[PDB]
Design a protein around this ligand. Structure first.
Ligand SMILES: [Cl-]
Ligand SMILES: [Cl-]
Lengths: 99, 99, 99
């Protein structure tokens, strides 16, 4: 009756502490899940942005390639032009000798 | 003994409830970690993607600079071509007057 | 009463085991949060990389558009230059026939 009720006093006080710890734990878990859900939200955003960026890069890469082809064709024509202009200047110099 | 038995009955009931809470809490934790691990997997994919994209942007940026530099040369050459043509046109107009 | 003693010892053991389970649960929670906080740190790094990449893409996109514009203009100028040259060659042919 003195040790048994000592024992029950210990049991009930431990149970009450455990109840508190369970309450604190539930809160920790809630607070954790807020962080986790915020992370999932942020990840979803980033995933969408990466997708868009990957698409915009692909497009940019295609266009660069396109512009590169065009540039080569341009450089080609310009070399022809400069060569033709040189022929012309020499034609003119020959004509000026005959007048 | 009757009072102690009543106390034991309440104790056992509380302990039963605590055990259920704890089982519930464990489930919560493991479900939380399913999400956390999927988050981590998704971050990993995104990081790889961000890395590919960063490289691809670097390449595109270099190609753009190179095209921009070629373009500047081309524009100078067109300047030169146009002045040569203008000179030629003058020379031609003069020659036409002499013949 | 010897049963009562068995039962209290039973109870004390179960409470001991519950306390250990609580301690284990807390550890799980803090370990979970280490993963969560690392995820948060990694998401932040990725957000910053994405924001930079988005800007750089925009810059590149603008520059491609500007180069494309420039090249379209050069192509127009070449079209005209080539016309000026056909005409010049015609004139020169005419001059050659008159001298
Ligand atoms: Cl780009
Ligand atoms: Cl997370």
């Amino acid at each position: 009756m003195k040790q048994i009720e000592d024992k029950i006093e210990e049991i009930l006080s431990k149970i009450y502490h455990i109840e508190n710890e369970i309450a604190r734990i539930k809160k920790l878990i809630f607070d954790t899940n807020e962080k986790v859900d915020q992370n999932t939200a942020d990840i979803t955003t980033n995933t969408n942005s990466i997708n868009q960026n990957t698409t915009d890069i692909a497009t940019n890469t295609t266009n660069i390639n396109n512009l590169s082809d065009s540039m080569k064709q341009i450089e080609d024509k310009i070399e022809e032009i400069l060569s033709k202009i040189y022929h012309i200047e020499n034609e003119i110099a020959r004509i000026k000798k005959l007048i």
